[PDB]
Amino acid sequence: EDPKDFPVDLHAFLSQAVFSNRTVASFAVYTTKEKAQILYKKLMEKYSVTFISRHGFGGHNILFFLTPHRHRVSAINNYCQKLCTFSFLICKGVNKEYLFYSALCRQPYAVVEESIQGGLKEHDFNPE
């Protein structure tokens, strides 16, 4: 059985309003390692990301990315789903950027690749 949602330990950081027509600038994707490998570079280029990271979790991968322009979650999901038939893929907006990335850099998650050397810094966002 493929996952039907992100792991529960990330729920608090994610927006559940997948049909929201508000535009946002931070997204997450949960899919296979094969599809995430491909999407890491495709999304980097498509959305001119300011940051993207790919993380492993129990054989699958999670992508996290930030964009210089805002987008609807539905648009990003549509683009990602184009790659899959087939493979599962969950796409949600991220409400708590630094907390989400931080969780993805601690067990049980691991960073596999990221687009800025040294990753995101706490000081790159305002405090909570």
Author numbering: 134 to 261
Please give the exact wording used by the authors of the publication that reports this structure.
The JCV OBD (residues 132–261) crystallized in three different forms that were termed form 1, form 2 and form 3. Form 1 has two molecules in the asymmetric unit cell, and together the three crystals provide four independent structures of the JCV OBD. JCV OBD region B3 (residues 216–220) is poorly ordered in crystal forms 1 and 2, but well ordered in form 3. Crystal form I crystallized with two OBDs in the asymmetric unit. The molecules are orientated in a head-to-tail manner and situated at approximately right angles to each other (94.5°). This dimer contains a small interface (∼550 Å2) that is buried between the adjacent JCV OBDs. Therefore, we examined the higher order structure that the JCV T-ag OBD adopts in crystal form 1. Interestingly, the JCV OBD forms a right-handed tetrameric spiral. The angle between the monomers is ∼900 and the rise per monomer is ∼9 Å.
The topology of the JCV OBD is a five-stranded antiparallel β-sheet sandwiched between two helices on either side.
